[PDB]
Amino acid sequence: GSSGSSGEFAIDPNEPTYCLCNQVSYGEMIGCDNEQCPIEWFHFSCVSLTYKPKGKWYCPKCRGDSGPSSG
């Protein structure tokens, strides 16, 4: 990558986005065990991850579904 350049937190229309922060893949990323998941791609730092977990990892968007807006 680039040694260092100001102007972070920017989403370019050139490259797509997956992670929740909607940013271009970078650093370490894992594939949500849930295939159906349209993202199946999230950053570590974002998902408070230090290293590839030796266990099924389900994005915070899948594991948290129960609970509809209205009752």
Q: Give the Å distances, CA to CA, from 42 to 4, 62, 70.
A: 23, 12, 28
Q: What angle do CA 16, 24, 15 make, to 5 degrees?
A: 35
- 12 marked as part of a ligand binding site: no
Nearer to Zn ion, 11 or 21 (CB): 21
Q: How far is the CB of 21 from Zn ion (least distance, A)?
A: 4
Q: How many residues bind Zn ion (CB under 5 A)?
A: 9
Distance of CA 37 to the CA centre of its chain: 11
For residues 32-51, which are near Zn ion according to CB under 5 A?
A: 32, 34, 37, 43, 46
Amino acid at 69: S
Interaction site with Zn ion (CB under 5 A) = 19, 21, 32, 34, 37, 43, 46, 59, 62
